[PDB]
Design a protein around this motif. Structure first.
Motif, PDB file in Angstrom:
ATOM      1  N   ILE A 135       0.825  -1.309   0.124  1.00 50.31           N
ATOM      2  CA  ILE A 135      -0.098  -0.067   0.027  1.00 50.31           C
ATOM      3  C   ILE A 135       0.797   1.308  -0.060  1.00 50.31           C
ATOM      4  O   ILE A 135       1.821   1.314   0.593  1.00 50.31           O
ATOM      5  CB  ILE A 135      -1.129  -0.227   1.296  1.00 50.31           C
ATOM      6  CG1 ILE A 135      -1.606  -1.100   1.558  1.00 50.31           C
ATOM      7  CG2 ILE A 135      -2.011   1.102   0.989  1.00 50.31           C
ATOM      8  CD1 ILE A 135      -2.417  -1.794   0.412  1.00 50.31           C
TER       9      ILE A 135
ATOM     10  N   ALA B 117      -2.728   0.036  -4.096  1.00 45.32           N
ATOM     11  CA  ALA B 117      -2.388  -1.279  -3.602  1.00 45.32           C
ATOM     12  C   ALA B 117      -1.727  -1.889  -4.785  1.00 45.32           C
ATOM     13  O   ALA B 117      -2.409  -2.341  -5.618  1.00 45.32           O
ATOM     14  CB  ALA B 117      -3.686  -1.755  -2.968  1.00 45.32           C
TER      15      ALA B 117
ATOM     16  N   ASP C   4      -6.631   1.993  -3.739  1.00 44.15           N
ATOM     17  CA  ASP C   4      -6.709   1.439  -2.139  1.00 44.15           C
ATOM     18  C   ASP C   4      -7.936   2.549  -1.541  1.00 44.15           C
ATOM     19  O   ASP C   4      -7.552   3.597  -1.364  1.00 44.15           O
ATOM     20  CB  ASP C   4      -5.550   1.556  -1.602  1.00 44.15           C
ATOM     21  CG  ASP C   4      -5.617   0.859  -0.213  1.00 44.15           C
ATOM     22  OD1 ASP C   4      -6.210  -0.148   0.080  1.00 44.15           O
ATOM     23  OD2 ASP C   4      -5.254   1.466   0.994  1.00 44.15           O
TER      24      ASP C   4
END
Ligand SMILES: NC(=O)c1ccc(F)c(Cl)c1
Length: 209
Positions: free
Chosen positions: A136, A146, A160
């Protein structure tokens, strides 16, 4: 919206060799990831020397080690410069193609596997202990992304939607079933003291309930 990419052949070869070669000294993965975090922290520090606003996304420069026995994950968090989406796709900001070639050439000339970090591809040593790695990351110039791979020749990238990080990188190691020693406080402390005792940023080892 998940994008799936093929590793370049040379990187897939390096990962297969990390996964399938018999090599007992697996603990070096943590040194390599901590060193990567230290390099990323150096980069955002340097940028902030002439532009203080580069730290508006977070003034603290640190490294956290977070074991989770329930999830069987070891997470390495830093507040370094982070990576853009283009960085993630381009082998997580590394020159992995030429680095793999140099690492290969050095091994033929008598270098050790533990020297992987000298060739800019120390990240992939994560696969000594992890069956899956999730990265991440948040860079000042891009959104939070991500990256994820279980090797096998491919990786994924998605936006993400999880916990915002502000700036930096989170490497989540989904450990192999027989590698859970790297979740034990005393083992992590031993490795950090042996291999990372002079890193110039605070390393905080979290404990568990
Ligand atoms: N050729 C090898 O045995 C070899 C080369 C590089 C590595 F990172 C590992 Cl784990 C094994």
């Amino acid at each position: 919206e998940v994008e799936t990419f093929a590793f370049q052949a040379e990187i897939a070869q390096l990962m297969s060799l990390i996964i399938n070669t018999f090599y007992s000294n697996k603990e070096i993965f943590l040194r390599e990831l901590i060193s990567n975090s230290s390099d990323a922290l150096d980069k955002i520090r340097y940028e902030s020397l002439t532009d203080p606003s580069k730290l508006d996304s977070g003034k603290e420069l640190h490294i956290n080690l977070i074991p989770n026995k329930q999830d069987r994950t070891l997470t390495i968090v830093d507040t370094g410069i982070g990576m853009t989406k283009a960085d993630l796709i381009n082998n997580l900001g590394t020159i992995a193609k030429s680095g793999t070639k140099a690492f290969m050439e050095a091994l033929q000339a008598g270098a050790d596997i533990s020297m992987i970090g000298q060739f800019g591809v120390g990240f992939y040593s994560a696969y000594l202990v992890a069956e899956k790695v999730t990265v991440i990351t948040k860079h000042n110039d891009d959104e939070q992304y991500a990256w994820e791979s279980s090797a096998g020749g491919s990786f994924t990238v998605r936006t993400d939607t999880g916990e915002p990080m502000g700036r930096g990188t989170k490497v989540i190691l989904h450990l192999k079933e027989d590698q859970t020693e790297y979740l034990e406080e005393r083992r992590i402390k031993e490795i950090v003291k042996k291999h990372s005792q002079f890193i110039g940023y605070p390393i905080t080892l979290f404990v568990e309930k």
